[PDB]
Amino acid sequence: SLVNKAAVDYFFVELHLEAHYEALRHFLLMEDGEFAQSLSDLLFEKLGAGQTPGELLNPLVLNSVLSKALQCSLHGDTPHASNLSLALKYLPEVFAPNAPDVLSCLELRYKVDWPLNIVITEGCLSKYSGVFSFLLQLKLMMWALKDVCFHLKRTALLSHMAGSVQFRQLQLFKHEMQHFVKVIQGYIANQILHVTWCEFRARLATVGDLEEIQRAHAEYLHEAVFRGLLTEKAAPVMNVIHSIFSLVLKFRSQLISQAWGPPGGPRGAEHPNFALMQQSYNTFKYYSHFLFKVVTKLVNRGYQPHLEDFLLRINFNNYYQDA
Amino acid sequence: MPREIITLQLGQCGNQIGFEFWKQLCAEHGISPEGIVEEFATEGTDRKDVFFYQADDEHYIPRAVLLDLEPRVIHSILNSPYAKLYNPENIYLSEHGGGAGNNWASGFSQGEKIHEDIFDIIDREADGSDSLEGFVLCHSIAGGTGSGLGSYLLERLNDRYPKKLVQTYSVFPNQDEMSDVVVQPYNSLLTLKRLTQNADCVVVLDNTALNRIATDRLHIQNPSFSQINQLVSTIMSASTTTLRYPGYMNNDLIGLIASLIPTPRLHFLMTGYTPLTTDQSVASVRKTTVLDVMRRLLQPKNVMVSTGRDRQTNHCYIAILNIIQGEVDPTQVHKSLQRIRERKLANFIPWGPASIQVALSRKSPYLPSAHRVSGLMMANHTSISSLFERTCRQYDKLRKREAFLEQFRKEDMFKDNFDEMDTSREIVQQLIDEYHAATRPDYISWG
Amino acid sequence: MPREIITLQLGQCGNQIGFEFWKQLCAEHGISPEGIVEEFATEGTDRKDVFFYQADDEHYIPRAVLLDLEPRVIHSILNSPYAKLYNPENIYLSEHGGGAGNNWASGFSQGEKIHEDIFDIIDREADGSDSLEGFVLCHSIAGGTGSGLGSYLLERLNDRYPKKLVQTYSVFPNQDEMSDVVVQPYNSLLTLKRLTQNADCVVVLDNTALNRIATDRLHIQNPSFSQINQLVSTIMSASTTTLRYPGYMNNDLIGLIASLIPTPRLHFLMTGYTPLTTDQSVASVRKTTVLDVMRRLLQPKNVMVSTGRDRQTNHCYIAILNIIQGEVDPTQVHKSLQRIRERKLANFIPWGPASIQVALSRKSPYLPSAHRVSGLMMANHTSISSLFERTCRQYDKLRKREAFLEQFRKEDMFKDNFDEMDTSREIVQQLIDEYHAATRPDYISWGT
Amino acid sequence: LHGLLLDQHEEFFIKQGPSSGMLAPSLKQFSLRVEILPSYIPVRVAEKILFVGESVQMFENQNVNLTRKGSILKNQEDTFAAELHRLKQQPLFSLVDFEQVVDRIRSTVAEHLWKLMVEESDLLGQLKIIKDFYLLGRGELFQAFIDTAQHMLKTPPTAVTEHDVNVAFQQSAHKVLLDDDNLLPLLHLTIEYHGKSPREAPASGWAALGLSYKVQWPLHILFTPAVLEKYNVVFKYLLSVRRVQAELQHCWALQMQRKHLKSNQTDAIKWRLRNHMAFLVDNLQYYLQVDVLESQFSQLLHQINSTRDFESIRLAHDHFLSNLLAQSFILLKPVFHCLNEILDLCHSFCSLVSQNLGPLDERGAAQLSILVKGFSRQSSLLFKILSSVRNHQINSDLAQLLLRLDYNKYYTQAGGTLGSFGM
C-alpha cells in the first residue's frame, strides 16, 4: 500500500500523467477547435481535389497544414500541441473518390517517456492514433459535404439559382445528410469523446500503480472505441456507417463537380449532374432507412445496447421512424 | 481557422444590439470597455478574431462597422461602454444628424451616400480577421435608420464580397407592440427585400417575440427597442459561444447551420434556448437536466420567434439541433430523448432523416455562468413562416393604408408609392410559404 | 399514465361549485390558488395529472373550464386568488352579466354560443392531458345558468369526446329551501335530458339532502347556496380522492364507475359519507370507528340524496362502494363490514353480484381532516329513484305548466314548447322504474 | 473464525457441501456431516454451528469483495479463541459452555450484520422497491403501465418484443411521472411465448411476461433464486389481476361512450354483469392489498425495525412472503385453477361489453350468454369455497373475501353466482 501510494504520487507530480492526458485532449481530441477546423478544411479540399497521398501527405504539405492550423488555433501554440505529429501509416497511390477511409493513413503519435511508457503503452498510442485518424476522416467527410454545400450556395448567389428545383433538392439532401452525420458525430463525441474521457480522468486520478495506470488508459481507449463503434462487434455497423459516409461523399462529389447553371426555365437552374445527385440522394435515403431498420432490429435483439443509443441519435426527432 | 463575423450596427436598435454584443463578448473574454484584456482575463481560450480585431497585442477592437443615417444612435454608442470597442474609423455617422425620418428609403439613401466609408470600415474589420467568412449585419427592420442603413450595409457587403456569404440578423417589427415607427411595416418590407436580393440568409427576428419574452420571462412590461436589441445580442452571444470558445465540436458556422438550412431559399431559421432564465434570476444556479432543458425549450417563452396562431396549417419543426454548452451528462441527454419520445415533444419532417444534433461547447472562463448547462437550438420550423407572413401582412396593410408614408415620401424610393414595400411583402410571403413547405414531403420538388 | 379528468364548470352556480371543488383539490394536493405547489405538498402520492395540468414547469393548473352565462361568479373567480387555476382559454364569461334568469334554456343557448370555444377548450385540455379519461361537468341543475350551461357542456363533451366518459354533477333542487329558480324543474329536466343523451354518468345531488346534512352534521342552521355548493364540492372531492390520491385500488375513473353503473342509461348515482364532521367541529376528536361510520352511513341523514318516501317501490341498493380516506385500521374495516352485514345496512340487486365495497385510503397530508377517520360511499340505491322520480314529476309539472318558461322561451330550446322537458321527465321516470327494477331480479334488463 | 473449512481428510463432523455459487462459492460450500456429527454434538447445536460456519464463510466471501471492513467480532475473535483453548484445556467436554460461546459469537456477528444491512446497506429501500415493482406495491402506477402497454403486451411475446415492452413500461413510467432511472434498470422484461424461443407456452405471450430484479451484494444473499421466483409469480398474478381490472374499466368506458346509445336488454345485461364483476374484483383487490399485502409488509417492517439480528430480518421477510403466498390461494392448486377460469370468464365478459356499444349481435349475444353462464358457475364455486373456508376457519383472508363479496347478500341471495347477464 505504501508503494502504491508513493507510485500514484510520483506518477501524478513527477510523471505529469494528468498533463499527458490534458495534452491528449488538446491535440488528439481536437480541443483546439481552430486547428481542427483548418485541418478538416485542408483535408476535404485535398480529398475532393483528388490529391494523391504522395502529394497530400508530402512533408511540406503536412507541415504547412499543421503550422497553419496551429497558428490559427488559440491552443495550437501550446506545448501540448507541440507533442502532436501528423504521420503516414501508408502512402496511397491515388485518393479513392468518395472513400471515407481516404485519410486513414494519417496517424497522430504521442511520445511517452520512461516509466510512463509502461503505462502509456505503444498499443495505447496506436489506439489513440487510430481514434485520431477516424475523427480526421469523419471531419474530412463533413468538411467535404460542407464545401459542396458552400459551392452550391455560391453558384446560386452568382446565378440567382434560388429557384432551381434540382439545386434545391440537392441542397435539401445535403442538409439532411449533414444533420444525420452531425447527430451521429454528437452521439459519438458525447459517449466516446466526452463520457469516456471523463471516465479516463477519474481513472487516471485513481491509478495506484503503473499496471493500474496502464489498465485505466486501456479502459479509456476501449470505451472510446466501443462508444465510437470501433469494436469488432460494431465492425458490421461501422462498415455500414462507412458505406453510408461513402455514399454521402459520392453525392457531395456529384453536387460539387459542377456549379449551378443559370436559371433557364420555370424549373429554375439545372445541374448537369442533377440526375446523378438525385440518384445518390435516393440511394442515401434507402441506405439510411435500411440502417435504421437494422439498428432497431439489433437493439430489440439486445446484441448491441449502445446501438440503441445510435438509433436514438439517428432518429432523435423520430424523422427516420416516420419514414 | 474560425469563420470570422463582421458585425454591422445600423440605427438605434442595431447600434444598441452591437453595443450589447460587444459588452457580452468583452465580459466573456475579460476585455475592458476600452478593448484591453483585463489582468484577470488570463484564459486566452476565447476567439476574439471571430468578432473582434486586434489593433495591437493588448487592444481588442470589434470587427464592427457602424453605419447610421441618424446621429442619435452613434452618439448613444459613443456614450455606451462599447464606444472604445469599435474602431472609430469604422463608425459612420451622418453629418446632417437629421436621421432618416423613420423612413427606410431615407436610411438606405444615406447608406448609399456613406457606401464608400462603410465598405472601407467593413474591409478594415475584415483585414483584422484571419479567416473572415463574411459579414453579419445586425439591425432592426422597423426604424428608419436601422432599416435603411442595414439594407445599405447588406448591399455593400454583397457588392464587395460577392463570393462570400452575407447573413443578416434583421429585427422585424413587433406586431403585438405598437411600434413608435408608424412606417415600420414599410421599413420591414424594404429590409426583407434587401435580404432577399443582397443577403444569402436572413434570420427573422420578430420584435414581438422579444417583447413577449421580456414580459413573460424578464418581467419587462414594455420592452424597449434597446432592450429587445440587447436581448438579441445576448441570444447571439450564447449561440456564438461555440464559435468564440473553440472546442472538439461546432468549431465552424457551417457545421452548426448545415442541419438548419435545407434549401438556399428555405433559409428562414427558428431558434430555441434552454434553460431560459431572466437576467435577474442568475442567483439560483438551477441544476437543470437535459430532460429539464428539453422541457423548458418547448415553452413558448423561450422561443425567439413570434409565430401567429395559424389555425389552418399545422406548422411544425422540420429539424432541431441543440448546441448545449456547460456541464451536460450524456445520460441526461438520453433521458431527455426518452421523455421527449414518450411525450412526443418533437415532430420532425417525414420525408428525410432529421435528428437533434448535439454540439458541446466550452463556457467562457472569465464569465461566470449562472447555469450549469446552457443551450442554443437552431431549428427549421414551419411556424417561422408565421413571423414572415405576419411581417408581410403588416407591410401590405401599411402600403395599402399609406400609413406614415409622408415620412417615407421624403425619400425618393418611397416618395410616390410603396410598391417596393408591397413587392417585398409578396416575396417575403413566398419565402414564408417555402419555409412552411419544407415541413412537407413535397419540399423535395420545391422550386 | 394517470386517467386525467377535465372539470367543466357551467353557469354561475356551476362555476362557483367548480371553483370551490378546485380550491378543495388544491388544498388537498397542496396547490396554491395561483397554481404553484405549496412547500407542504411533499406527498407525491396524489394523482395531480388526473385533475391538474401544468401551466408552466412549476405551476400546476386545475383542469377546470369555467363557463357562465352570468358574469358575477366567473368574474369573482377571475378576481379571486384562484384566477390562475383555470385555463383562461377555457373561461367564457357573458359580457352582459345578466345570467340565464333562472332559465335553463338561456344557459343552454349561452353554452351553444360558446360551443365551438368550449369544445376547443376541451380538446386543448385533452391534449394537455397525457391520458385524458373524459370530462366531468360541475354545475347546478336547479338554476338557469348552471343547468343550461351544464346541458351544453354535456352535449359538447359528447360531440368532442364521444368515446370518452362524460360525468355530470346535476344538483337537484332543495325541497326544504324555497328555490329562487322557479324554472328549476324545467332546468332539472334539461339537465336530466343531457345526462340521458350526452352525459355518461349523472351523480344526483339533492340540495335538500345537502341541507339536511349541513344542519344535522355540519351544524349549519341556514345553508347558503354557496354553502350547499361547497358541501357538494367537498363530497365530490372525498368520493374522488382515490382517483386524485392514487393507491392500490380504484386507480382509474372507469374502474371506479364500472361497479356503479349497471346499465349505460342507469347512470344515476347516490352518495353517502361517514363519519360526517363540520370543519368547525374539529375540536372534539370523536373516536369514530369504521363500524360506527358504516352504521351512520346507513342513516338517510347521511345519504347525499333526498329521496321522497316512495311507498310503492321496494327500494334497495344496486351497488355500494365506500371510499374511506385517512388512517384506517384493517381490523376496523373488518368490524365495519361485520356490522353492516349483521345490520343488513344494504339490500342488493337480485340480478347480479352486489355488496358494500370498502376502500381504505390515506388522507391528503395537505388537507386537514376534521375527522380522524372519514369515508365517502358512492352507491346505486333504488331509493335514489324516489329522488329521481320526484325530479321527473317536478319537470313534468313545470313543462305542463310552462312555469318560469318565459325566461327560457327567449332561448330557442324552450321558445316554442317544453317537449324536451317532457321527454326528459319520461326518461327520468323510466330511470326511476329501472332503479326500482334494479332492486328486482329483472335488473338484468334495467334501463331498457 | 475464517470461514475456512480446513478439512482435507473429512475428519471433522462438517462435510463440504456443493457450493451453489466470483459468484463466491456458496455458503453451502461447507455442510454438516450428520453421518460424522458426534452424538455428543446436539442436532440443535449442530444447526447453530452450521449457521455460524455459514456466517463466517459469508463474511469472508463478502470481505473478499468488500473493502477491509474488519470482522464483526474484530479483536473479540481472539477472545473466543482463548475461550476455545480453555475448552480444549477442560478435562470434560461441556456442550453448554461450547454452545454459550458459539451463541455469543453468533449474536455479535448477527447484530453487526443487521446493523450493516439496515443502516449501511439500506435493506428497507430495497424491500420497498421490491414491493413497488415485484409485489406491484405501486398498484396505481402498474395499473397505468398495464393500461398503456396493453396493446404491446396483449400479443404473444417475442424475443424482440421484450425490448418493446420494457420501452413501453419506461414510457408509461415517464407518463406516470415515474422518473426513477435507478428502478427501470431493475426491471427486466421476459420471454417469448406462442409464435412471436417463442415455441413453448401454456397460455400466450401475454401471460408469459415477467419481471426479474438483480439483487446486489450483499443483498443477493437475501433475494435467493426461490425468492425471485416467488416474486415473479406474484408479479404475474398481480399483472393478471390488473389486466382483468383494465378490461372491466374498458368495458365501463365503452358503456359510458355508448351512454348516448339506447341501452338494450343485452347491453344492460352486459353492463350489469360488468358492474357486478367490477365490484367483486375491486373488493378482492382491496382485500389482497390491505389484508394480505399491506398487512404482511407492515409486519415485516415492524419486525425488521424491532430486530437487531440480520437473520431475524430475513425471517420476518420470509414470513411476510409466506403470508402473501398463503392468502393469495396460490398454493390451493384447484382453487387457483378455478380462479383462473373465473378470471378468464370475467375478462371475456368485459371484452364483450367493451366491444359492443349497442345491443349484442347474435355472435355477441352468444358470447354474452356463455360468459354469463361461465361467470355464474365460477362465482358460485368461488362462493362455496369461500364459505367452506370461513366455516373451517382455515384462512382468515378467504372469510374476509366471502364477507366482502356477499356484504349486501346479493351473491348470497343469488346463491353465490354472479347474476346471469341476460342475452
DSSP per residue over B18-31, as a string? HHHHHHHHHHHHTB
Q: Cβ separation of B338 and D170 shorter than 8 Å?
A: yes
Q: Which residues of B touch D179 (CB under 8 A)?
A: 291, 335, 339
d(CA D417, CA D386): 13
C-alpha dist (Å) from residue B22 to B26, B82, C279: 6, 6, 63
Q: Cβ separation of D286 and C49 shorter than 8 Å?
A: no
d(CA D358, CA A207): 73
d(CA D19, CA B55): 79
DSSP one-letter code for D119: I
Q: Tell me which residue of D285, A169, A251 sits closest to C247, measured CA to CA.
A: D285
Which of D181, D182, D184 best tests the B interface by mutation, with the highest count of B CBs <10 A? D181
For residue C122, give the H/E element and its range: helix C115-127
Q: Do residues D3 and D57 touch, judged by C-beta distance below 8 A?
A: yes
- The 3-state DSSP class for residue D17 equals coil
Chains contacting B (3 or more CB pairs within 8 Å): A, C, D
Q: How many helices (H) and strands (E) does chain D have?
A: 15, 2
Return the C-alpha cell found at A100: 471515407
**Calculated CA dihedral for residues B413, B418, B422, B427, nearest 10 degrees:** 10
Q: Do residues C166 and C159 touch, judged by C-beta distance below 8 A?
A: no
Which residues have CB under 8 Å from C442's CB, separation 6+? C351
**Cβ density class A66-90: b for 16+ within 10 Å, e for less:** bebbbebbbbbebebbebbebebee
Chain gaps in chain D, named by the residue before each (C–N > 2.5 Å): 21, 196
Q: Do residues C76 and C113 touch, judged by C-beta distance below 8 A?
A: no
Q: Do residues B414 and B104 touch, judged by C-beta distance below 8 A?
A: yes
d(CA D405, CA D383): 8
Q: Which residues pair with C138 in a beta bridge?
A: C9, C169
Q: Cβ separation of A162 and B262 shorter than 8 Å?
A: no
Q: Do residues C240 and C249 touch, judged by C-beta distance below 8 A?
A: no
Q: Cβ separation of D408 and C199 shorter than 8 Å?
A: no
State yes or no: C146 annotated in a binding site: yes
Q: Which residues pair with C271 in a beta bridge?
A: C378
Q: Do residues B89 and B116 touch, judged by C-beta distance below 8 A?
A: no
For residue C77, give the H/E element and its range: helix C71-78
* Burial class, B72, CB count within 10 angstroms (exposed 0-12 / middle 13-18 / buried 19+): middle
Alpha carbon of residue B296 to chain centroid: 21
Q: Tell me which residue of D147, D145, D121 sits closest to D133, measured CA to CA.
A: D145
Return the C-alpha cell found at C239: 368520493
Q: Which residues of A touch D160 (CB under 8 A)?
A: 297, 300-301
d(CA C374, CA C217): 13
- The 3-state DSSP class for residue D383 equals helix
Technique behind this structure?
Answer: cryo-EM
Give the distance from residue A265's alpha carbon to the nearest chain B alpha carbon, in angstroms: 11
CB of A154 within 8 Å of any CB in chain B?
yes
Q: Tell me which residue of C434, C4, B272, C399 sits closest to D177, measured CA to CA.
A: C4
Q: Do residues D386 and D399 touch, judged by C-beta distance below 8 A?
A: yes
Residues, chain C: 448
- The 3-state DSSP class for residue C169 equals strand
The full DSSP string for B95-129 is TT----TT-HHHHHHHHHHTHHHHHHHHHHHHHT-
Q: Which residues of B touch A186 (CB under 8 A)?
A: 249, 357-360
Q: Cβ separation of B251 and A183 shorter than 8 Å?
A: no
d(CA C274, CA C295): 9
Determine if the peptide bond prior to B275 is cis (ω within 30°).
yes
Q: Do residues D65 and D221 touch, judged by C-beta distance below 8 A?
A: no
CB of D43 within 8 Å of any CB in chain A?
no
CB of B294 within 8 Å of any CB in chain C?
no
C-alpha dist (Å) from residue D405 to C251, C376, C405, D15, D19: 20, 19, 48, 55, 49
DSSP one-letter code for B59: B
Tell me, what amino acid is at D181?
D
C-alpha dist (Å) from residue A280 to A102, A247, A299: 20, 7, 28
Give the distance from residue D163's alpha carbon to the nearest chain A alpha carbon, in angstroms: 5
Tell me, what amino acid is at B245?
Y
Which of D166, D170, D172 best tests the B interface by mutation, with the highest count of B CBs <10 A? D170
Phi, psi of B86 (to 5 degrees): -85, 145
Which residues have CB under 8 Å from C388's CB, separation 6+? C204, C268, C428, C431, C432, C435
- The 3-state DSSP class for residue B67 equals strand
d(CA A314, CA B439): 18
Return the C-alpha cell found at B245: 470558445
Q: Do residues B305 and B383 touch, judged by C-beta distance below 8 A?
A: yes
CB of A299 within 8 Å of any CB in chain D?
yes
**Cβ density class D357-367: b for 16+ within 10 Å, e for less:** bebbeeebbeb
Q: Tell me which residue of C166, C180, C243, C179 sits closest to C211, measured CA to CA.
A: C179
Q: Tell me which residue of A109, A105, A145, A165 sits closest to A255, measured CA to CA.
A: A145
d(CA B279, CA B276): 10
Phi, psi of C322 (to 5 degrees): -100, 115
User: Assign residue B433 a region: left if phi > 0, alpha if psi is -120 to 50, beta otherwise?
Assistant: alpha
Alpha-carbon Rg for chain B, nearest whole angstrom, is: 21
State yes or no: C448 annotated in a binding site: no
CB of D132 within 8 Å of any CB in chain C?
no
Q: Which residues pair with B52 in a beta bridge?
A: B62
Q: Do residues A235 and A223 touch, judged by C-beta distance below 8 A?
A: no
Q: Tell me which residue of D243, D181, C316 sits closest to B334, measured CA to CA.
A: D181
The full DSSP string for A205-239 is HH--SHHHHHHHHHHHHHHHHHHTT-SGGGHHHHH
- The 3-state DSSP class for residue D183 equals coil
Q: Within a 10 A sphere around the Cβ of D22, how many other Cβ atoms?
A: 8
Q: Do residues B188 and B141 touch, judged by C-beta distance below 8 A?
A: yes
Question: Please, what is the angle between helix A165-188 and helix A305-314, to 10°?
Answer: 150
For residue C54, give the H/E element and its range: strand C52-54
Q: Cβ separation of D144 and C2 shorter than 8 Å?
A: yes
State yes or no: C144 annotated in a binding site: yes
d(CA A42, CA A86): 13
d(CA B276, CA B304): 11
d(CA C436, CA D219): 60
Which of D131, D148, D176, D256 best tests the C interface by mutation, with the highest count of C CBs <10 A? D256
d(CA D178, CA C2): 11
Q: Do residues B201 and B165 touch, judged by C-beta distance below 8 A?
A: yes
Q: Tell me which residue of C159, C244, C144 sits closest to C199, measured CA to CA.
A: C159
d(CA B427, CA B434): 11
C-alpha dist (Å) from residue B332 to A191, B289, D181: 12, 6, 10
Return the C-alpha cell found at D362: 347474435
Q: Do residues C254 and C133 touch, judged by C-beta distance below 8 A?
A: yes
State yes or no: C147 annotated in a binding site: yes
d(CA D423, CA D264): 10
d(CA A258, CA D164): 47
State yes or no: C423 annotated in a binding site: no
Return the C-alpha cell found at A314: 439517428
d(CA D296, CA D148): 29
Phi, psi of A298 (to 5 degrees): -70, -45
Q: Which residues pair with C10 in a beta bridge?
A: C67
d(CA B244, CA D52): 67
Direct distance between the N- and C-terminal alpha carbons of chain B, in angstroms, rounded to an integer: 34
C-alpha dist (Å) from residue A148 to A251, A259, B95, B258, D63: 9, 10, 45, 11, 62
Q: Tell me which residue of C237, C25, C254 sits closest to D143, measured CA to CA.
A: C254
Which of D67, D158, D163 best tests the A interface by mutation, with the highest count of A CBs <10 A? D163
- The 3-state DSSP class for residue C411 equals coil
Give the distance from residue B33's alpha carbon to the nearest chain C alpha carbon, in angstroms: 38
Which residues have CB under 8 Å from C356's CB, separation 6+? C294, C317, C320, C321, C322, C337, C340, C345, C346, C377, C379, D407, D408
Tell me, what amino acid is at A309?
D
Locus of grid cell 346534512? C213
d(CA D195, CA D209): 14
Which of A296, A300, A307 best tests the D interface by mutation, with the highest count of D CBs <10 A? A300
d(CA C409, CA D258): 31
In B285-348, alpha helices (H): 290-297, 330-343
Choose among B47, B245, B447: nearest Cβ to A164. Answer: B447
Return the C-alpha cell found at C300: 338517510
Tell me, what amino acid is at A146?
K
Rounded to the nearest 5 degrees, what angle is found at the Cα of B99, between the Cα atoms of B395 and B420? 30
Q: Searching chain B, which residue's CA lies closest to the CA of residue C129?
A: B343
Q: Which residues of A touch B447 (CB under 8 A)?
A: 162-165, 167-168, 267-268
d(CA A208, CA A216): 10
Phi, psi of C9 (to 5 degrees): -110, 120
Q: Within a 10 A sphere around the Cβ of B97, how many other Cβ atoms?
A: 12
C-alpha dist (Å) from residue D177 to B343, B346, B428, D94: 11, 19, 44, 63
Show which of residues 344-403 on chain D sit within 8 Å of chain C, judged by CB atoms. Answer: 379, 400, 403
Q: Within a 10 A sphere around the Cβ of B168, how many other Cβ atoms?
A: 30
CB of D170 within 8 Å of any CB in chain B?
yes
d(CA A89, CA A104): 8
Q: Which residues pair with C52 in a beta bridge?
A: C62
For residue C203, give the H/E element and its range: strand C201-206
d(CA D187, CA D189): 7
Q: Tell me which residue of C218, C201, C193, C343 sits closest to C273, measured CA to CA.
A: C218
CB of B296 within 8 Å of any CB in chain C?
yes
Q: Cβ separation of D163 and A300 shorter than 8 Å?
A: yes
CB of B281 within 8 Å of any CB in chain C?
no
State yes or no: B283 annotated in a binding site: no
Give the distance from residue C3's alpha carbon to the nearest chain D alpha carbon, in angstroms: 8
SS (H, E, C) D205-261: HHHHCCCECCCCCCHHHCCCHHHHHHHHHHHHHHHHHHHHHHHHHHHHHHHHHHHHC
d(CA D118, CA D114): 6
C-alpha dist (Å) from residue A110 to A39, A117, B201, C105, D27: 18, 10, 43, 87, 50
The full DSSP string for B419-441 is HHHHHHHHHHHHHHHHHHHTTSG
d(CA D93, CA D95): 6
User: Assign residue C164 a region: left if phi > 0, alpha if psi is -120 to 50, beta otherwise?
Assistant: beta
Q: Do residues C139 and C146 touch, judged by C-beta distance below 8 A?
A: yes
d(CA A145, CA A143): 5
d(CA A76, CA A74): 6
d(CA D369, CA D372): 5
Q: Do residues A220 and A199 touch, judged by C-beta distance below 8 A?
A: yes
d(CA C236, CA A172): 57
Q: Tell me which residue of B239, B179, B169, B147 sits closest to B424, measured CA to CA.
A: B147
**Calculated CA dihedral for residues D418, D419, D420, D423, nearest 10 degrees:** -120
Which residues have CB under 8 Å from C419's CB, separation 6+? C399
